[PDB]
Symmetry: C2
């Protein structure tokens, strides 16, 4: 399952064959994790895609969870250190969302990220997500509960 | 497991013994559903409590899901027709939240309800929840996707 993104970028559904290489990147920046995500991916309970840039694995773009009935997905992503700040996530995400709007099984795309997560907030804004609210102390990290921005983009009928 | 609420109200953790009676109320307004919720309840993945008023079963008060690490719970509830509009959910919920703040495993209590759900919005406001945002077209119901208010109350340290 490949989702074209651009001349140099493409998303590939996470496969058992990727485990070796991703683990390398995980470590640098698993099988059970991947096998587990593949099962959700086949059931439409989540999606796990690998981002390839000029054929090199560069990071992961996920729908952490999906609410089939509400046709809603929460987005999660991470990029290897040498592939950050280059719009690879922005172009990959717009392509992925367009592709699912065309499939039709997802219409509401959601990004929940810490208010202090400078990188995720910028992806949300560059990709025209609307800030719907701020969940107080919603995410525990490093001993504290941090506020989280909830962003959404709808792509379906007018 | 009983959580006192008041002179006449109390919450009882859903038990296999309740199936017969709840099913009656479900029908009026299951075992698999209950057995399934009991398992999540024992693991702290959700909670399902039965609301009793003067010893008669009157409805259900649930933590539809829990995020153990974030110590966050999403609230769900329903009352039999003859027990609505009487603050039974409001008193039961304040008691339940206080009880969990004392246990300490939950500090962020969340109510997501349709903007047009007059009853749930009033419970949220009467129980001092803060409206954190409005999720656009987030809940499918009767052929349409409806906007949903997200409310939260934190009960932990100052």
């Amino acid at each position: 399952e490949i989702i074209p993104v651009s001349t140099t970028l493409e998303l590939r559904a996470a496969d058992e064959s990727h485990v070796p290489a991703l683990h390398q990147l995980v470590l640098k920046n698993t099988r059970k994790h991947v096998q587990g995500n593949i099962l959700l991916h086949q059931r439409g309970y989540a999606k796990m895609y690998l981002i390839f840039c000029q054929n090199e694995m560069a990071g992961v773009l996920s729908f952490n969870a999906i609410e089939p009935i509400n046709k809603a997905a929460y987005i999660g992503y991470w990029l290897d250190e040498s592939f950050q700040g280059q719009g690879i996530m922005s172009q990959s995400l717009q392509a992925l969302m367009t592709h699912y709007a065309r499939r039709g099984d997802i219409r509401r795309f959601v990004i929940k990220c810490r208010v202090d997560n400078q990188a995720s907030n910028a992806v949300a804004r560059r990709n025209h997500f609307t800030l719907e609210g701020c969940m107080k102390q919603a995410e525990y990290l490093n001993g504290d509960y941090h506020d989280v921005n909830m962003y959404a983009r709808i792509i379906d009928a007018d």
